[PDB]
Design a protein around this ligand. Structure first.
Ligand SMILES: *[C@@H]1O[C@H](CO)[C@@H](O)[C@H](O)[C@H]1NC(C)=O
Ligand SMILES: *[C@@H]1O[C@H](CO)[C@@H](O)[C@H](O)[C@H]1NC(C)=O
Ligand SMILES: *[C@@H]1O[C@H](CO)[C@@H](O)[C@H](O)[C@H]1NC(C)=O
Ligand SMILES: *[C@@H]1O[C@H](CO)[C@@H](O)[C@H](O)[C@H]1NC(C)=O
Ligand SMILES: [Ca+2]
Ligand SMILES: [Ca+2]
Lengths: 172, 319, 321, 172, 319, 172
């Protein structure tokens, strides 16, 4: 993918996570947890909603019949109508194929970008108190209880509180 | 060291979509953009509609028996059916398809009496076995078959003139009877050479009843060919004829606009639609459709595509 | 003194210029053309049961002009009309000419069916002209008969001829009306009487009066034979009421199946394959667009007002210096 | 470009590299080396192949003639056909110009993204044992022989083996 | 305490709303319009060899109606027709009127060529009418002659006139057939005899019978209906007539190509344009336009959109 | 946004900055300053100029009248023209809506990318002498006078000259 997270450095998705699109799993002394990120899940859903609002629509143009279902039309004008309609249908077929292909590419890469933006938000929060796993995880070099983990998810984690402890553990 | 992992959801059963680069890309969710489902019914709920059933639109101007329920009215939707009857007595209409199309764009028909009266030497109420009505022989309700009262006698050289007193244009129709044999012609209109002149400010034309052998349609080798023209407000149209004219009792006035539908599908006044085709209605919110390239109303665009799936979620990466 | 691993991308000496959304002169490593500029000046007919009409105009196949004698029947999936092709030996035209031509050029073959029409002793069926030469001797349209009085000046017998369609598919019947040069010629062939020609089926009906008037000579003949046509549905009859001036069909035609009509001056080639054709020949390209002609037939790349459209097939080229 | 690597922090391309699109150059005691990355080269090529499969196509719609080459057409219907064909050609010309412009933009940025994703994969592998040059190179703070360099390319480099040596060299 | 370097981007107080793929209400720093709503109520004719026909209808320049006297010949690259323009001084119409008008409005000029036609002593060539006034005195179509008997009541001499096209390009020949009001008027001008008018070329052929009651148009029940055909190079056209023909003194030749404009808007030779409509000129550099779906020349495409704003700056994130 | 800078980790824009699109604010002993980045501002403007050159255009195709303003047209051909014109207008309306929507999305994300590319250029320049604020700022762990700040903006800052001082302040 463009942003290298989904089908990238994050090996696979979580079938277990059913309350959001993006979120966290942690392990500390006290045990394991899982929680969804609202802000980033809603960002992705709202952008997809926007596309559906734009694409699931028809023109309000009223078209009348120019081909009789039940009677023969002059052969020359019939051939012009047939040529014109088939030309219009080739254009709309092409436009439809390109629209969906293009939007599908954007939707996938957009979703990839929202995952990466969350990862980068956390990376910067943890500052010098953590290191990148390579698999989308952060090894935290201090006791991070369920209250500390909550502070990372809620964007209230203060790196300065745990800095001295963390740098000692990192340098060893 | 403690550990916090970032991740995204996945699903067991993902859906395949096409991208710019990949023909088989699995995502968590997708929705269809092309409608394949039709309702085999004409959804007429919001609509002051008119189902002509057995009646062909031209038939409502000349008044074929089958059209007796359809000589006047107002509508926003008009539904023509297959094998609908326009002519009880065999014949055709010059510019048939232009006239049919003109009626099927209309939002109703008003009728206006021409007032035409004929001398004692003319029989106005000529009838045929083909145009049955009340179980007895009859004729087109909006026209009169003008014949001599004394059989064989030459037809009185007569003149009838309709003036348009209205503020809007009127659609006048008349017929010319082309008999099978020189025996039938002389029998009804007399031995003399026949001429029929029609003249207005805008329109002008001459008609000669041609006589010649032809195949039987409903056991009748005779033909009544119909003609038509617009008569502008305050203008006159004059019919100079020495026999062979089928004269109008009434002219027609097409009012406003309406959606013409050609379909075999039954009506349903419970269901709403703005898009119709031969096979019925299309109620879909989807932008595209692969049911028919022949549709009428506000329609999704026809595409040469079974399915076009639009991704509504991220790449599905299972474990 | 410290070890070092560097990441990089390839480049090339001679890169190619493409257009992007933002940049008109963007250099990339590789690109490929999307618009075809090359045509083959030949009709590529490999895998096609084709028919080159050469000198014969499609309408000529229905009425049987000499030039069309080798093209009165057959089956094809491709029909090739040529420039200045002959439809009419005797001067005249066909009402709805272009609708009829177009109808033949969509067909996949022609069958012929005898009308069976017979005429009294007072009618000469085998009327001939110097214009329609065949076997080095005077002749006429093979699928029609020029009906004239056998005794010059005599009024033409009021005759009635009726063709029934016994077949399961519709038939294409054609007839002619002879409009003579002078009142002298008319009275000479059909007689002094006023002339009328009625044609009637279930669906079709029409009347024709041979008009007489001075006009220039086309192949040294001031006379005109104007042709008319209609479809006759299965089980239906068409009747010809005439008192002289009718050019009556000996045979009707049946158009069979479907075929691709091509108008071109280009020679044939049964070694080469194509599904797209134009005046100038064939278009074999796999490319999506084409700037050769807006007038093409078959399965064709779309015409664009563009010499070239280069599609990038590699990254930005950032060369070493 | 979008991802800031190609025509970005990587100053120029390598005319020398003819066995791949992306790859590595290293310098150690043992000397200099160059090798192509298969995975990332094939990722870029496969995406471009996908585009060519979608774009190098015509519709299978059969069109008949509505203009005679060899005879004059009615003047009114001729003008309608001329107007219609010119309108259709304006649409296809526009669609073609936009398609190629849009794909060209995507191809370039896609290739940029594959370069960056490789750089980021390596960055995370080396963890605290290296520092970013700024020019797309990594200064490794330990003896990295041709076998160690191969381990970086093959995604088997274990940072923990060289960590203590590297952190000492980095802090001095 | 550590020193600090911050990165940031501009913003503006008054940002503009644009639509994106994902967001209908996206605020950016700057945007520009892509749909033109403004027209100039003038025909911008700078750099154009133009011809404003004013009161003259294009058909009138071929037959030479008084109003068209300044427009019988010339060359142009632009021809401007006006509302209620006069084609016919004497009441009548032209078969294929709109095909002929359209053909003239594509042309880049008209040349005239003398037919040379001469008539015997028993024919009055210079027949005149009160309807076609010129120099304040009775006159007729400049490019045609009204052929009548010199002795009133006398039968009209059976005459034959033939025009040959000596040129390398096709010529447009026009003639008229006078359909008189009454059998009294007909016998008075052309005589008691049955009237026939034959016209024949290599390609074209047709017969015309002057049909004889209809309403008064400018107080005249008489009609002159006009016909036309192309005459190919080296080919002849012959007029066989025994009275009732309105014969050409000159044929016409349409030269090169030109842009036909139908508009009520005044001219301006200071302003330049390549796009025109009923309401005037469109000079915009913008790709789209919502003024009219009926335009001519090199035009922005018509769209069903008031406004389409194209972002020319980043997201506006204010303080 | 795709690149997570504008309407992302950078909290808001600067109404005060009127000499560029992107730039710097610094605080040192000496006081406060603000300066615009030319290279990155011109990169964004040049790409937008490119779009305007491509989009602000009409076709040079000459179209003639097929509908008379002042006279009635044959009813059958009029209906064909009406159907054709309305179909063409539906296509152009759609194409116009999609073009602008698509370009608007790209312009916004492109501008986001130029901001991020500048941030990443600075991050790499400062190497081990600074740490990420999380709000698009860099805390520099050494005396950085107005001449030092200028060196960061002008891409001439040499990390090696301040390294030993900075690492001591960072480890504390
Ligand atoms: C137009 O197309 C339909 C089917 O798409 C076909 O049945 C019909 O014959 C065609 N009309 C002409 C005049 O070729
Ligand atoms: C239609 O366009 C072609 C373009 O060359 C031209 O030759 C032809 O005469 C045009 N037809 C009309 C009626 O303008
Ligand atoms: C927006 O762009 C145009 C330049 O074409 C200009 O009129 C306008 O002043 C620009 N900026 C603002 C903030 O309005
Ligand atoms: C074509 O469209 C215009 C506007 O809708 C209308 O006035 C005109 O009557 C239409 N033409 C026909 C023949 O229906
Ligand atoms: Ca066809
Ligand atoms: Ca209409």
């Amino acid at each position: 993918g463009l942003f290298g997270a989904i089908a990238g450095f994050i090996e696979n998705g979580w079938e277990g996570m059913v309350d959001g699109w993006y979120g966290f799993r942690h392990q500390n002394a006290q045990g394991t947890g899982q929680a969804a990120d609202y802000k980033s899940t809603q960002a992705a859903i709202d952008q997809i909603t926007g596309k559906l609002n734009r694409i699931i629509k028809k023109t309000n143009t009223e078209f009348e019949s120019i081909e009789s279902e039940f009677s023969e039309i002059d052969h020359q004008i019939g051939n012009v109508i047939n040529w014109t309609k088939d030309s219009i249908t080739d254009i709309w077929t092409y436009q439809a194929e390109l629209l969906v292909a293009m939007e599908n590419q954007h939707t996938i890469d957009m979703a990839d970008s929202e995952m990466l933006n969350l990862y980068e938000r956390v990376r910067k929060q943890l500052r010098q108190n953590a290191e990148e796993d390579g698999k989308g995880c952060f090894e935290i070099y201090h006791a991070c209880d369920d209250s500390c983990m909550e502070s990372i998810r809620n964007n209230t984690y203060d790196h300065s509180q745990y800095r001295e402890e963390a740098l000692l553990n990192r340098l060893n | 060291p403690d550990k916090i992992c970032l991740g995204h959801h996945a699903v067991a059963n993902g859906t395949i979509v096409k991208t710019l680069t990949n023909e088989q890309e699995e995502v968590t969710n997708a929705t269809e953009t092309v409608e394949s489902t039709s309702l085999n019914r004409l959804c007429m709920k919001g609509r002051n509609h008119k189902d002509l059933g057995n009646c062909h639109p031209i038939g409502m101007l000349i008044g074929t028996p089958a059209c007796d329920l359809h000589l006047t009215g107002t509508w926003d939707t008009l539904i023509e059916r297959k094998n609908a009857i326009a002519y009880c007595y065999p014949g055709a209409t010059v510019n048939e398809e232009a006239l049919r199309q003109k009626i099927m764009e209309s939002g109703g028909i008003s009728k206006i009496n021409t007032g035409f009266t004929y001398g004692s030497s003319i029989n106005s109420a000529g009838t045929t076995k083909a145009c049955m009505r009340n179980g007895g022989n009859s004729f087109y309700a909006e026209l009169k078959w003008l014949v001599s009262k004394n059989k064989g006698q030459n037809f009185p050289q007569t003149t009838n003139t309709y003036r348009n007193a209205d503020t809007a244009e009127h659609l006048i129709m008349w017929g010319i009877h082309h008999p099978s044999s020189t025996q039938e012609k002389n029998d009804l209109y007399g031995t003399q050479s026949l001429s029929i002149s029609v003249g207005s400010s805008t329109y002008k034309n001459n008609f000669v009843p041609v006589v010649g052998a032809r195949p039987q349609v409903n056991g009748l080798s005779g033909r009544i060919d119909f003609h038509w023209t617009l008569v502008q407000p305050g203008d006159k149209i004059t019919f100079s004829h020495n026999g062979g004219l089928i004269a109008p009792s009434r002219v027609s006035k097409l009012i406003g606009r309406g959606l013409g539908i050609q379909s075999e599908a039954p009506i349903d006044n419970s269901c709403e639609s703005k898009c119709f085709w031969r096979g019925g209605s299309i109620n879909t919110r989807l932008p595209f459709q692969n049911l028919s390239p022949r549709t009428v109303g506000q329609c999704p665009k026809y595409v040469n595509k079974k399915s076009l799936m639009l991704a509504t979620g991220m790449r599905n990466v299972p474990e």
